[PDB]
A paper describes a structure:
Bacterial β-lactamases in Gram negative bacteria are primarily responsible for the inactivation of our current β-lactam antibiotics. Penem and penam sulfone β-lactamase inhibitors bearing heterocycle substitutions at the C6 position via a methylidene linkage are two compound classes that inactivate class A β-lactamases by forming a long-lived intermediates. The compounds first form a covalent bond with catalytic S70 concomitant with opening of the β-lactam ring, thus forming an acyl enzyme, followed by opening of the second ring. Despite their similarities, these penem and penam inhibitors undergo different cyclization reactions forming distinct long-lived cyclic inhibitory intermediates.
Residue numbers in the entry: 26 to 238, 240 to 252, 254 to 292
Amino acid sequence: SPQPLEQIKLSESQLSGRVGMIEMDLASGRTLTAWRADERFPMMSTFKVVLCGAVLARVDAGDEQLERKIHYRQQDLVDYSPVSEKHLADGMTVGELCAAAITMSDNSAANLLLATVGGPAGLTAFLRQIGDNVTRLDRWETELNEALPGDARDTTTPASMAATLRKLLTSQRLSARSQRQLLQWMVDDRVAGPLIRSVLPAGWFIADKTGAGERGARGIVALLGPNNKAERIVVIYLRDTPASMAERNQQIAGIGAALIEHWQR
Ligand SMILES: OC[C@H]1O[C@H](O[C@H]2[C@H](O)[C@@H](O)[C@H](OCCCCCCC3CCCCC3)O[C@@H]2CO)[C@H](O)[C@@H](O)[C@@H]1O
Ligand SMILES: *C(=O)c1cc2ccccn2c1N[C@@H](C(=O)O)[C@](C)(COC(=O)Cc1ccccc1)S(=O)O
């Protein structure tokens, strides 16, 4: 594999799309690789990690409990509810809803949680409160995946998302337990995580949330490192490519391979 930046360029050439990327030390925030780091990309499902950060902040404040059972109706369900559709009779706890949102990409779980934090406006306010002045959520699932060209709704920048993830995971804004919970939810991805492990060399740590959208939008927020440590945050977004999902996946994997082969920088 070539150097990370050279691979990123190749990916734009092959895909005819825009790639946005940040590689950042998790402990310190040192930026290692930055490409289109200040350009806007749709968050898609990656917003769910921020959402559950906001939920945990409420838990820490005594305004929420992870144990609290939420009951909902079939009419509340939106497209793709693999966990939440199974609990119309018995409900789900707030913590279970965050697990379903993050580890199973359950859209109804995400919307139920979004309601608890004051909707898209509330989550945007939370972002402003932790010092992210760029990322914005405007819509609910699944409209937030629309990825219209030039539409600022429901977008982040790679630099903003990386900084925000680091804030939630490490800055002591969240309690120790809450930081640990948010990390464990990302470790526990039931879909991409296990497949990624199968193709990672031995010794590489992975935790992640993936996302997809219209017009080729695709992305991942990940923790990655050798020696079985979450050494770095890697944020990669793609937009405005006509390519197959398989090729978008391949290109993101290729950027990963470049990082792995050229890790010491
Ligand atoms: O010399 C370094 C390594 O080179 C190869 O490893 C390959 C591996 O066989 C391949 O499967 C992976 O693809 C990358 C797949 C990563 C999956 C997605 C990555 C995630 C991580 C967070 C951001 C991007 C998405 O690349 C590495 C590096 O070339 C060798 O197989 C391995 O023995 C050796 O230790
Ligand atoms: C966010 O999670 C999201 C947004 C969105 C829009 C349309 C369709 C699906 N979708 C998701 N979730 C999927 C995603 O692609 O991120 C999931 C998690 C499917 O995941 C994968 O396909 C990742 C993967 C790639 C290659 C190999 C193995 C796994 S969801 O549909 O289960």
